[PDB]
Design an enzyme around this catalytic site. Structure first.
Site, PDB file in Angstrom:
ATOM      1  N   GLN A 106       0.849  -1.188   0.000  1.00  0.00           N
ATOM      2  CA  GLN A 106       0.000   0.000   0.000  1.00  0.00           C
ATOM      3  C   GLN A 106       0.894   1.251   0.000  1.00  0.00           C
ATOM      4  OE1 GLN A 106      -2.423   1.720   3.210  1.00  0.00           O
ATOM      5  NE2 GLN A 106      -4.211   1.350   1.871  1.00  0.00           N
ATOM      6  N   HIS A 162      -3.135   4.349  -2.029  1.00  0.00           N
ATOM      7  CA  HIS A 162      -3.952   4.751  -0.877  1.00  0.00           C
ATOM      8  C   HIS A 162      -4.712   6.019  -1.209  1.00  0.00           C
ATOM      9  CE1 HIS A 162      -5.689   5.085   2.882  1.00  0.00           C
ATOM     10  NE2 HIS A 162      -4.661   4.815   3.674  1.00  0.00           N
ATOM     11  N   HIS A 208      -9.248   7.512   3.301  1.00  0.00           N
ATOM     12  CA  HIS A 208      -9.012   7.842   4.699  1.00  0.00           C
ATOM     13  C   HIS A 208      -8.428   9.228   4.928  1.00  0.00           C
ATOM     14  CE1 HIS A 208      -8.908   3.214   5.586  1.00  0.00           C
ATOM     15  NE2 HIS A 208     -10.107   3.648   5.228  1.00  0.00           N
ATOM     16  N   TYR A 240      -6.055  10.866   3.315  1.00  0.00           N
ATOM     17  CA  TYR A 240      -4.654  11.127   2.956  1.00  0.00           C
ATOM     18  C   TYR A 240      -4.587  11.906   1.631  1.00  0.00           C
ATOM     19  CZ  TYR A 240      -4.029   8.406   7.089  1.00  0.00           C
ATOM     20  OH  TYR A 240      -4.117   7.964   8.384  1.00  0.00           O
ATOM     21  N   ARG A 254      -7.289   1.832  -3.230  1.00  0.00           N
ATOM     22  CA  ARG A 254      -8.210   1.847  -2.105  1.00  0.00           C
ATOM     23  C   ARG A 254      -8.891   3.194  -2.029  1.00  0.00           C
ATOM     24  NH1 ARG A 254      -8.021   0.018   4.374  1.00  0.00           N
ATOM     25  NH2 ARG A 254      -9.455  -1.704   3.926  1.00  0.00           N
ATOM     26  N   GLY A 291      -9.012  -6.539   8.987  1.00  0.00           N
ATOM     27  CA  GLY A 291      -7.978  -5.768   9.662  1.00  0.00           C
ATOM     28  C   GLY A 291      -7.611  -6.340  11.025  1.00  0.00           C
ATOM     29  N   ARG A 292      -8.390  -5.991  12.027  1.00  0.00           N
ATOM     30  CA  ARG A 292      -8.054  -6.358  13.392  1.00  0.00           C
ATOM     31  C   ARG A 292      -8.034  -7.869  13.621  1.00  0.00           C
ATOM     32  NH1 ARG A 292     -12.108  -1.885  15.592  1.00  0.00           N
ATOM     33  NH2 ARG A 292     -13.127  -2.697  13.711  1.00  0.00           N
TER      34      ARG A 292
HETATM   35  C1  LIG Z   1      -4.266  -0.532  13.677  1.00  0.00           C
HETATM   36  C2  LIG Z   1      -4.914  -0.241  12.338  1.00  0.00           C
HETATM   37  C3  LIG Z   1      -4.141   0.316  11.315  1.00  0.00           C
HETATM   38  C4  LIG Z   1      -4.692   0.617  10.056  1.00  0.00           C
HETATM   39  N1  LIG Z   1      -3.890   1.072   9.056  1.00  0.00           N
HETATM   40  C5  LIG Z   1      -4.377   1.221   7.803  1.00  0.00           C
HETATM   41  C6  LIG Z   1      -3.512   1.528   6.718  1.00  0.00           C
HETATM   42  O1  LIG Z   1      -2.251   1.543   6.827  1.00  0.00           O
HETATM   43  N2  LIG Z   1      -4.084   1.706   5.485  1.00  0.00           N
HETATM   44  C7  LIG Z   1      -5.441   1.673   5.303  1.00  0.00           C
HETATM   45  O2  LIG Z   1      -5.897   1.860   4.170  1.00  0.00           O
HETATM   46  N3  LIG Z   1      -6.257   1.336   6.318  1.00  0.00           N
HETATM   47  C8  LIG Z   1      -5.752   1.112   7.566  1.00  0.00           C
HETATM   48  N4  LIG Z   1      -6.574   0.685   8.561  1.00  0.00           N
HETATM   49  C9  LIG Z   1      -7.924   0.179   8.191  1.00  0.00           C
HETATM   50  C10 LIG Z   1      -7.847  -1.317   7.877  1.00  0.00           C
HETATM   51  O3  LIG Z   1      -7.205  -1.546   6.619  1.00  0.00           O
HETATM   52  C11 LIG Z   1      -9.196  -1.998   7.686  1.00  0.00           C
HETATM   53  O4  LIG Z   1      -9.957  -1.375   6.631  1.00  0.00           O
HETATM   54  C12 LIG Z   1     -10.070  -2.079   8.905  1.00  0.00           C
HETATM   55  O5  LIG Z   1      -9.267  -2.434  10.023  1.00  0.00           O
HETATM   56  C13 LIG Z   1     -11.152  -3.135   8.609  1.00  0.00           C
HETATM   57  O6  LIG Z   1     -11.975  -3.278   9.706  1.00  0.00           O
HETATM   58  P1  LIG Z   1     -11.778  -4.505  10.721  1.00  0.00           P
HETATM   59  O7  LIG Z   1     -10.547  -4.210  11.550  1.00  0.00           O
HETATM   60  O8  LIG Z   1     -13.055  -4.405  11.520  1.00  0.00           O
HETATM   61  O9  LIG Z   1     -11.638  -5.758   9.837  1.00  0.00           O
HETATM   62  C14 LIG Z   1      -6.050   0.388   9.785  1.00  0.00           C
HETATM   63  C15 LIG Z   1      -6.802  -0.173  10.837  1.00  0.00           C
HETATM   64  C16 LIG Z   1      -6.264  -0.465  12.092  1.00  0.00           C
HETATM   65  C17 LIG Z   1      -7.152  -1.073  13.156  1.00  0.00           C
END
Ligand SMILES: Cc1cc2nc3c(=O)[nH]c(=O)nc-3n(C[C@H](O)[C@H](O)[C@H](O)COP(=O)(O)O)c2cc1C
Length: 364
Positions: free
Chosen positions: A98, A179, A182, A184, A231, A321-322
């Protein structure tokens, strides 16, 4: 179950539809914003994912907004990422990088020259970013008011994306993910809330989308369209960046334009962690009509919701993600209906191995 069936994603074939979402973890070395062997181990542990999407990674030094986020602009970064991709491939995985520019979600103290970060317009993000204290610990600090990019600086930004994609190819990544979500830099141009420009990069949706489409065209030409994902988070509000008063129409415009480039995938971040109104099936249908590659959904998905929408033909894959933070073998756990490890959100950002590489697989 369709979650555990293969999917052609541009130039690669994922063996399942359970993808690791991009996750900023802020564990890179400073000085140098260098990926580490510990990050290599973390990604290697998760190599059974249909596709790993890396943490957001700087295209340039100027792109930096977070202490501990890695780059893909220097020789040392490229060498370090080569080792990480090699490890994922040794375990028969696939990994996308990314690529971001943080724009106004940044702080002068980590910018070149200690100067204000850049954006579409000179408007503060009114949020916080993550820096490091004198002992290397993650701290949250208010964002610095940015400087509006000059028109003549825009080609440089496009070139930095192009160069980063060239570097990604050399570093052994399978795909790149732009990216454009969000709040950015790319999203700062897309949104009328953060873009008050009066040149050809502001105003109409065609103008607000101009930068992202120039980037897409540059990176497709540099490598290949089937190596390029993007994204977006085009419905709702993310880190104080809304999508303006015509968000659906403007999203569909962007998606129709992206489709013309024949890119590998469209990754939709549907809501932020604090939640929001769900995507309607009607909107999902309108996205499908317009886009002819892979569609990845994300945002608090369960395996049940993922199967539902994949089964309905509306998306192709789900990025978790989490659950991926906490479950290196999430694929096997979902496939067997096993319990998941508990999450430890306190160690999501910064630190070391604890809360990073110490979540176990089902079996040792
Ligand atoms: C600790 C953390 C860091 C994240 N960093 C990014 C990132 O670097 N790039 C991005 O597009 N989204 C980021 N996100 C969003 C995640 O890619 C993802 O869309 C989201 O966690 C999905 O929801 P879930 O955790 O309920 O599966 C981040 C989320 C968390 C919790």
């Amino acid at each position: 179950e369709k979650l555990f069936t293969p999917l052609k994603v541009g130039a690669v074939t994922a063996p399942n539809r359970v993808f690791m979402a991009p996750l900023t973890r802020l564990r890179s070395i400073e000085p140098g914003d260098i990926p580490t062997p510990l990050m290599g181990e973390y990604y290697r542990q998760r190599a059974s994912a249909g596709l790993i999407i890396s943490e957001a990674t700087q295209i340039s030094a100027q792109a930096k907004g977070y202490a501990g986020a890695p780059g893909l602009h220097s020789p040392e970064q490229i060498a370090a990422w080569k080792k990480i991709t090699a490890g994922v491939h040794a375990e028969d995985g696939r990994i996308a990088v990314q690529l971001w520019h943080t724009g106004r979600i940044s702080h002068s103290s980590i910018q070149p020259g200690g100067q204000a970060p850049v954006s579409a317009s000179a408007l503060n993000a009114n949020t916080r970013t993550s820096l490091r204290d004198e002992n290397g610990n993650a701290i949250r600090v208010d964002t610095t008011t940015p400087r509006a990019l000059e028109l003549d600086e825009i080609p440089g930004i496009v070139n930095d994306f192009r160069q980063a994609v060239a570097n990604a190819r050399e570093a052994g990544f399978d795909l790149v993910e732009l990216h454009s979500a969000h709040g950015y830099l790319l999203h700062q141009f897309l949104s009328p809330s953060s873009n008050q420009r009066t040149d050809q990069y502001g105003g109409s949706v065609e103008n607000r989308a101009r930068l992202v489409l120039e980037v897409v065209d540059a990176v497709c030409n540099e490598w290949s369209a089937d190596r390029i994902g993007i994204r977006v988070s085009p419905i709702g509000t993310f880190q104080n960046v809304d999508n303006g008063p015509n968000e659906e129409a403007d999203a569909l415009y962007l998606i129709e334009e992206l489709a013309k480039r024949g890119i590998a995938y469209l990754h939709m971040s549907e809501t932020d962690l604090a939640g929001g109104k769900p995507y309607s099936e009607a909107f999902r249908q309108k996205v499908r009509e317009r886009f002819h590659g892979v569609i990845i959904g994300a945002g608090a998905y369960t395996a049940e919701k993922a199967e539902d929408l994949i089964g309905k033909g509306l998306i192709d894959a789900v990025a978790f993600g989490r659950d991926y933070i906490a479950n290196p073998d999430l694929v096997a756990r979902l496939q067997k209906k096993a319990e998941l490890n508990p999450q430890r959100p306190e160690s999501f950002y910064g630190g070391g191995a604890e809360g990073y590489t110490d979540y176990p697989s089902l079996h040792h």
